[PDB]
Design a protein around this ligand. Structure first.
Ligand SMILES: CCOc1ccc(NC(=O)c2cnccn2)cc1
Length: 149
């Protein structure tokens, strides 16, 4: 699988994260990210994808060692952590054929797992519009505890 790179952008209070909503197979909410080009460095892919999806340039704010990385079904996703970005920042995608909306969400209200269907004696998980964000939520809360407390 081709690796993906992007960012977890937080506000000045560290309460809120910025999520993007795509279309079709990406119809729900997730962190801004995308696939690396041949010979493109990880930091440069993360800035490129975030700027295309939000209109905000992270290049001068990336810290090389501050990121969460997860391997999901063979494919690696790395999100650089970017705190302190003001909540009144104007965000606008470049690609509106790809991005429906951009919003701030409270970290403590986001799910860190989907709900089962054990009230119905049925297997699997119920739909959740935060599907793409969910795998990063617990590791994020643990990272913010260690770094800031
Ligand atoms: C990808 C299209 O957007 C949606 C919209 C709704 C849901 N399904 C839910 O059951 C739901 C209900 N309430 C809270 C959270 N999720 C999943 C994806």
């Amino acid at each position: 699988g081709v690796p993906t790179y992007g960012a977890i952008i937080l506000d000045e209070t560290l309460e809120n994260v910025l999520l993007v909503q795509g279309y079709l197979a990406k119809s729900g909410w997730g962190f801004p990210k995308g696939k690396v080009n041949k010979e493109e460095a990880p930091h440069d892919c993360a800035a490129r994808e975030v700027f295309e999806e939000t209109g905000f340039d992270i290049k001068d704010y990336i810290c090389k060692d501050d990121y969460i990385e997860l391997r999901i079904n063979d494919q690696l996703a790395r999100l650089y952590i970017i705190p302190g970005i003001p909540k009144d920042t104007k965000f606008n995608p470049k690609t509106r054929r790809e991005i429906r909306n951009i919003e701030w969400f409270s970290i403590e209200k986001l799910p860190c797992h989907r709900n089962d269907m054990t009230p119905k004696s049925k297997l699997g998980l119920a739909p959740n519009k935060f599907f793409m964000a969910i795998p990063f939520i617990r590791p994020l809360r643990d990272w913010l505890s260690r770094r800031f407390g």
